[PDB]
Amino acid sequence: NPLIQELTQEQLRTDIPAFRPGDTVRVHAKVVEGTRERIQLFEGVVIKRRGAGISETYTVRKVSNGVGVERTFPLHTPRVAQIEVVRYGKVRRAKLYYLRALHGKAARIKEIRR
RNA sequence: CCGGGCCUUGUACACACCGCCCGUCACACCACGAGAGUUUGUAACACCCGAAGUCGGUGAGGUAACCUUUUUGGAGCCAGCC
Ligand SMILES: [Mg+2]
Ligand SMILES: [Mg+2]
């Protein structure tokens, strides 16, 4: 594990803010077609971060057209150019898996301003 | 017994009782009903969820007009939230 950290330190990334579960975040996710490269903004609430160092992943939930969507990303990708936090929600949890069963007015996170 | 004539009478008969005519069945057609159910539609009702929008309450964030010091603070407004 020390060797692991020493190896993976260079591919670790530092443009990340210290965001949490509960807080809304936009991901500038770039997708690749081979001929073009398009960034698209996936906004959503963060249900979980999990992992250590470079195995750290986080998921982001959205409700596009009445269909709950849930998109996991590794934290340290070159294919995610920016991670904009836009609300600092308050929760008493780390894993917000209760949000999968709710819809809308009950699935609302209480913003803090901090 | 048959036939004929005269009166009268009843009749749903009038090529006039060798008349008329009821009902079932067979055949063909038509329309309708009931029917295990199946399929559409309307209109409400009881709950759940709930867009936009008005209204109400908040608004430590943002804010050229107003008052203030002018060096900034306020009033008000807005985003946003409920
Ligand atoms: Mg006879
Ligand atoms: Mg019928």
> Rounded to the nearest whole angstrom, what is the distance from the C-alpha of residue A45 to the centroid of ligand 2?
60
- Nucleotides of strand B lying closer than 7 angstroms to a protein CB: 49-51, 60-61, 81-82
Q: Calculate the alpha carbon distances from A30 to A36, A38, A89 in Å.
A: 10, 5, 26
For this entry, resolution in Å reads 2.9
CB A82 within 8 A of CB A42: no
Structure method: cryo-EM
Angle at A77 between CA A100 and CA A31, to 5 degrees: 75
Angle at A31 between CA A42 and CA A16, to 5 degrees: 55
Q: How far is the CA of A33 from the C1' of B33 (A)?
A: 69
> Rounded to the nearest whole angstrom, what is the distance from the C-alpha of residue A88 to the centroid of ligand 1?
113
Q: How far is the CA of A106 from the C1' of B47 (A)?
A: 18
Q: How far is the CA of A31 from the C1' of B2 (A)?
A: 126
What does the alpha-carbon distance between residue A95 and residue A88 come to, in Å, rounded to a whole number? Answer: 16
What does the alpha-carbon distance between residue A41 and residue A35 come to, in Å, rounded to a whole number? Answer: 20
Residues with CB under 7 A from strand B: A 103-106, 108, 111, 113-114
CA distance between the termini of chain A? 35
